[PDB]
């Protein structure tokens, strides 16, 4: 830490606190994440243990680089590459005009490459949300905050009391499934795709049941033909109202045919038939992809 000068605080949350800092010797600007560490009581949080072990395994252009870990008696610091803001803030600054379609397309494409990389290395992210997707001035976007990430060499059990985010949560989790799968990360990215296009969250629920009903109101109340097994999922109830699936031409008006088709496949109900990251990347929607730069 002797060779870092803190420059300014850029965020605080469940992680810890993140500072922009500069290496006094090399001039590199980094993001320093200080882990909330109680030395006399619980030790190193599970978030830092997961993020570190997994991020040190993952080297890819669309996953935030972890540069270094500074671990001393009282303190644990993660040193990350600096990126200059999160997608949430960019969506907010761009509401009104909207992010341009080509830049949306580029971000989707890059995020799918990052995810396909995570999934092929047995890592599930589980908490994709715009505040965890980081962008730079050259058109890159990168997955960040692997604090809730899990290795899935053996199936990951769901958490009775999910701390995971509501808005970007997959239906199979809301209906009580026992295990997560890679499919939950695709569902999230699908929601984010839609959000960028429409300039608002697709499914902004205020509770778990409201979150489910909001999904059902746009995608239709699912049944055994659309989703075999649904009816016997732990929190399925035969009393759910019946809503019709909506025309995507109305869910996401700005999208063309290829867009609606990809979106519809990322938001499939049945996690077994939900498109994979690797197959998404071959979708025709990406034929004409470029790498525009954002107006930050």
């Amino acid at each position: 830490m002797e060779n870092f000068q803190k420059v300014e605080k850029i965020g605080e949350g469940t992680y810890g606190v993140v500072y922009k800092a500069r290496n006094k010797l090399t001039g590199e600007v980094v993001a320093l994440k200080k882990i909330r560490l109680d030395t006399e009581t619980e030790g190193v949080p599970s978030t830092a243990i997961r993020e570190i072990s997994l991020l040190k395994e993952l080297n890819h252009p669309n996953i935030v680089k972890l540069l270094d870990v500074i671990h001393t008696e009282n303190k644990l610091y993660l040193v990350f590459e600096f990126l200059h803001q999160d997608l949430k803030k960019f969506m907010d600054a761009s509401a009104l005009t909207g992010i341009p379609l080509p830049l949306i397309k580029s971000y989707l494409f890059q995020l799918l490459q990052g995810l396909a990389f995570c999934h092929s290395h047995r890592v599930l992210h589980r908490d994709l949300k715009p505040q965890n997707l980081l962008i730079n001035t050259e058109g890159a976007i990168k997955l960040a905050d692997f604090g809730l990430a899990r290795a899935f060499g053996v199936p990951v059990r769901t958490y009775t009391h999910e701390v995971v985010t509501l808005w970007y949560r997959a239906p199979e989790i809301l209906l009580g499934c026992k295990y997560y799968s890679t499919a939950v990360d695709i569902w999230s990215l699908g929601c984010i795709f839609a959000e960028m296009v429409t300039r608002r969250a697709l499914f902004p629920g205020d509770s778990e049941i409201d979150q489910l009903f909001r999904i059902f109101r746009t995608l239709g109340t699912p049944d055994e033909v659309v989703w075999p097994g649904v009816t016997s999922m732990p929190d399925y109830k035969p009393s759910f109202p019946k809503w019709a699936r909506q025309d995507f031409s109305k869910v996401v008006p700005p999208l063309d045919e290829d867009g609606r088709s990809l979106l519809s496949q990322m938001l499939h109900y049945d996690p077994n038939k939900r498109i994979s990251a690797k197959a998404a990347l071959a979708h025709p929607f990406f034929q004409d992809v470029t790498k525009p730069v954002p107006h930050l």
């Binding site: 006399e40 009581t41 599970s46 243990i49 072990s53 671990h71 009775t160 799968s181 690797k278």
Partner: protein, 258 residues
Amino acid sequence: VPDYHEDIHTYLREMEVKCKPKVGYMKKQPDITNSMRAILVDWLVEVGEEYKLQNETLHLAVNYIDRFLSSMSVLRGKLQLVGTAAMLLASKFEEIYPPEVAEFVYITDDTYTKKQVLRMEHLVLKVLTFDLAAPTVNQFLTQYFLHQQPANCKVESLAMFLGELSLIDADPYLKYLPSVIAGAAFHLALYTVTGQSWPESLIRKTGYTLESLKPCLMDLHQTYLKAPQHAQQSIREKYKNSKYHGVSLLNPPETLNL
């Protein structure tokens, strides 16, 4: 989703070789023995049972211990503190929520303080350089189990029983990679329950023929034959439960037909 099944198998095979402990470390440990280590692992089994921890947690703890013991000399009096920190770390990596540190302190019958456990957690992380996502026997078996025709839960449980046995004795087992021990386990479980043999689906996936498996198998077969007499019994007691179809009751085949 099986779009990754192959890539993941292939990546586990790469990682298992990087997370391997040194096979000869016990002899260089001036003050501990294969036998003290076996006593420690059997105790962790029991901790896992008391606190209802997943099996993966146990396999990860043992990995962390053998790697830790591969570079740090430890006195027999501190060996349980190593194990406790390992189990705490494995817990945090693998469980939804870990037992509290204080629970860990109690399961040692209060022989260490809360602070000692925490400081050891830090030392273990440093020596393992935070590389905690190791492949285990449990993981490979879980991958192998997709290839059963058809699935048979007796086989599954018995194979998990044997993989767990293998943790107790560094004695032979530190010689073999986790994918090889899983292969042996799966075969010997399949054979025990049904008389069938390491399937050609897994020969192609793993690239291991039955033959290449045979050295590990003969060890595991002896291990299984001798299990009822072994000084450490906690794995047997655990696998008597109905949860596991009582497999550790089953009679081991006196011969393998090799």
